[PDB]
């Protein structure tokens, strides 16, 4: 290698998620174990975030900061009424965002 | 009619085997074989065996962190947490080395790999002590700017 | 507002082959039932279009790469079907190399 990232990130497996914002931007509660055909599974999410800005970017031309993007995993979330399966947002990476400066 | 199990019941029946994700509740002896599914996060069976029960999912203890969660058909995997790496002969997690000021990242500190540092070469510096920052290219003050401080391997140049 | 590395995001529900979290080549079932109710398995993917934008060339060499995440899906590992965490591309990021 001898290669480096523009934005540094740290990833960890999260097994105790309790809240998250859905694919509709609506915040919501996330349950633990789920029941899929008489068997119970733990809900696990591999989460990745930033530490910000960017490294190696030509400052003399662009403005930049590090942003954490996200994927969408289907999970069991209690909205208030009943539990339902919906796609939640999960921090998955850190990318540098560019913006023409001056 | 081949006995894909090599195991027989008390009357010549080739014991059935507990497939992937299922363990052996009770060993075939007087009767066939009793298989029950393993528990997600608790037990797994990555083998189609007529003699193997659901084994206990490996747990990450101490400085060990989950790198892979346990499924009913696959054990979990554990690696040394973010700030550490695994020492080869000891198997113990040791805190990553840091590239001190005037020194920079070459190779990241991950799992079995401890941080590989570098004394900053001609033209670069390292402002901090950590294991993520590589040596950076010096700022070149303008012909019109007052070089308040020059670039050394440990501090970048300053201007006005 | 640009992106250092150009990517494309897409919903995938035709996933056939996939690599699992242990690096195992595995097959992914078309649809699945949860309570006598069948859905197709969908996965949100982000890849590169194949060199990064706005990099300080004078000092660094750079290229874009596709990172991955892990998701649980129902797989038919040859014989039987099992739940595993498969690797799926989730973003395109830039890697630097000092010149
Ligand atoms: Cl990036």
Curated annotation (Swiss-Prot), chain A:
Highest taxon in the source lineage = Eukaryota
Please report any disulfide bonds recorded for this protein chain, giving both cysteine positions. 7-66, 50-94, 54-96
Which residues make up the binding site for a 1-acyl-sn-glycero-3-phospho-(1D-myo-inositol)?
44, 74
Q: Which family does it belong to?
A: Belongs to the NGF-beta family.
Per UniProt, subunit arrangement is: Homodimer. The homodimer interacts with a single NTRK1 chain. The homodimer interacts with a single NGFR chain. The NGF dimer interacts with a single SORCS2 chain (via extracellular domain). The NGF precursor (proNGF) binds to a receptor complex formed by SORT1 and NGFR, which leads to NGF endocytosis. Both mature NGF and the immature NGF precursor (proNGF) interact with SORCS2 and with the heterodimer formed by SORCS2 and NGFR (via extracellular domains). The NGF precursor (proNGF) has much higher affinity for SORCS2 than mature NGF.
Write down the disease named in this UniProt entry.
Answer: Neuropathy, hereditary sensory and autonomic, 5: A form of hereditary sensory and autonomic neuropathy, a genetically and clinically heterogeneous group of disorders characterized by degeneration of dorsal root and autonomic ganglion cells, and by sensory and/or autonomic abnormalities. HSAN5 patients manifest loss of pain perception and impaired temperature sensitivity, ulcers, and in some cases self-mutilation. The autonomic involvement is variable.
**What is the purpose of this protein?**
Nerve growth factor is important for the development and maintenance of the sympathetic and sensory nervous systems. Extracellular ligand for the NTRK1 and NGFR receptors, activates cellular signaling cascades to regulate neuronal proliferation, differentiation and survival. The immature NGF precursor (proNGF) functions as a ligand for the heterodimeric receptor formed by SORCS2 and NGFR, and activates cellular signaling cascades that lead to inactivation of RAC1 and/or RAC2, reorganization of the actin cytoskeleton and neuronal growth cone collapse.
Q: What is this protein called?
A: Beta-nerve growth factor
Which gene specifies this protein's sequence?
A: NGF
Q: Which residues of the full protein are shown?
A: 130 to 237 of 241
From Swiss-Prot, chain B:
Superkingdom is Eukaryota
Outline the TNFR-Cys repeats, range by range: 2-35, 37-78, 79-117, 119-159
* Intracellular or extracellular location(s): Cell membrane; Cytoplasm; Perikaryon; Cell projection, Growth cone
Effect after changing residue 31 to D: Loss of a glycosylation site
What PTMs does it carry? Subject to intramembrane proteolytic cleavage by the gamma-secretase complex, giving rise to an intracellular fragment that is rapidly degraded via the proteasome.
The entry annotates sugar attachment on 31, 41
What pairs make up the disulfide bonds? 3-14, 15-28, 18-35, 38-54, 57-70, 60-78, 80-93, 96-109, 99-117, 120-135, 138-151, 141-159
Q: What spans does the record annotate as topological domain Extracellular, numbered to this chain?
A: 1-160
Q: How does it assemble?
A: Homodimer; disulfide-linked. Heterodimer with SORCS2. The extracellular domains of the heterodimer bind NGF. The cytoplasmic region of the heterodimer binds TRIO. NGF binding mediates dissociation of TRIO from the receptor complex. Interacts with RTN4R. Interacts with TRAF2, TRAF4 and TRAF6. Interacts with PTPN13 and RANBP9. Interacts through TRAF6 with SQSTM1 which bridges NGFR to NTRK1. Interacts with BEX1. Interacts with BEX3. Interacts with KIDINS220 and NTRK1. Can form a ternary complex with NTRK1 and KIDINS220 and this complex is affected by the expression levels of KIDINS220.
Q: What is known of its domains?
A: Death domain is responsible for interaction with RANBP9. It also mediates interaction with ARHGDIA and RIPK2.
Protein's job:
Low affinity receptor which can bind to NGF, BDNF, NTF3, and NTF4. Forms a heterodimeric receptor with SORCS2 that binds the precursor forms of NGF, BDNF and NTF3 with high affinity, and has much lower affinity for mature NGF and BDNF. In response to proNGF binding, the heterodimeric receptor with SORCS2 activates a signaling cascade that leads to decreased Rac activity, reorganization of the actin cytoskeleton and neuronal growth cone collapse. Plays an important role in differentiation and survival of specific neuronal populations during development.
Gene for this chain: Ngfr
UniProtKB/Swiss-Prot annotation, chain C:
Q: Which UniProt keywords apply?
A: Cleavage on pair of basic residues, Disease variant, Disulfide bond, Endosome, Glycoprotein, Growth factor, Lipid-binding, Metalloenzyme inhibitor, Metalloprotease inhibitor, Neurodegeneration, Neuropathy, Protease inhibitor, Secreted, Signal
Q: Which GO terms describe its cellular component?
A: axon; cytosol; dendrite; endosome lumen; extracellular region; extracellular space; Golgi lumen; synaptic vesicle
Q: Where in the cell is it found?
A: Secreted; Endosome lumen
Q: Where does a 1-acyl-sn-glycero-3-phospho-L-serine bind?
A: 72
Q: List the disulfide bonds.
A: 5-64, 48-92, 52-94
Q: Which residues bind a 1-acyl-sn-glycero-3-phospho-(1D-myo-inositol)?
A: 42, 72
| GO function term, MF aspect, one | metalloendopeptidase inhibitor activity
Instruction: Provide the primary localization.
Output: secreted
Q: Which GO terms describe its biological process?
A: axon extension; cell surface receptor protein tyrosine kinase signaling pathway; circadian rhythm; extrinsic apoptotic signaling pathway in absence of ligand; extrinsic apoptotic signaling pathway via death domain receptors; modulation of chemical synaptic transmission; negative regulation of cell population proliferation; negative regulation of neuron apoptotic process
Quaternary structure (record): Homodimer. The homodimer interacts with a single NTRK1 chain. The homodimer interacts with a single NGFR chain. The NGF dimer interacts with a single SORCS2 chain (via extracellular domain). The NGF precursor (proNGF) binds to a receptor complex formed by SORT1 and NGFR, which leads to NGF endocytosis. Both mature NGF and the immature NGF precursor (proNGF) interact with SORCS2 and with the heterodimer formed by SORCS2 and NGFR (via extracellular domains). The NGF precursor (proNGF) has much higher affinity for SORCS2 than mature NGF.
Q: Family per UniProt?
A: Belongs to the NGF-beta family.
Question: This chain belongs to which protein, by name?
Answer: Beta-nerve growth factor
Parent-record interval covered? 132 to 236 of 241
């Amino acid at each position: 290698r001898g290669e480096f990232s523009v934005c540094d990130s740290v990833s960890v497996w999260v097994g105790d998620k309790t809240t998250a914002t859905d694919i509709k931007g609506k915040e919501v509660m996330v349950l633990g174990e789920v029941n899929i055909n008489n068997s119970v599974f733990k809900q696990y999410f591999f989460e990745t975030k930033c530490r910000d800005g960017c490294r190696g970017i030509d400052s003399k031309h662009w403005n930049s900061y590090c942003t954490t993007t996200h994927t969408f995993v289907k999970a069991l979330t209690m909205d208030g009424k009943q539990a339902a399966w919906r796609f939640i947002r999960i921090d998955t990476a850190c990318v540098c965002v560019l913006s023409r400066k001056a | 009619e081949t006995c894909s199990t090599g195991l027989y019941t008390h009357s010549g029946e080739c014991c059935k085997a507990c497939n992937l994700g299922e363990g052996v509740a009770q060993p075939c002896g007087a009767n066939q074989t009793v298989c029950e599914p393993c528990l997600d996060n608790v037990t797994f069976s990555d083998v189609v065996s007529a003699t193997e029960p659901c084994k206990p999912c490996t747990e990450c203890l101490g400085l060990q962190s989950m790198s892979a969660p346990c499924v009913e058909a696959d054990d979990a995997v554990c690696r040394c947490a973010y700030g550490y790496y695994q020492d080869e002969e000891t198997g113990h997690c040791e805190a990553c080395s840091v590239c001190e000021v005037g020194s920079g990242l070459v190779f990241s500190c991950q799992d079995k790999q401890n941080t590989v540092c570098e004394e900053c070469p001609e033209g670069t510096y390292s402002d901090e002590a950590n294991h993520v920052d590589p040596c950076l290219p010096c700022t070149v003050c303008e012909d019109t700017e007052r070089q308040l401080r020059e670039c050394t391997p440990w501090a970048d140049a300053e201007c006005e």
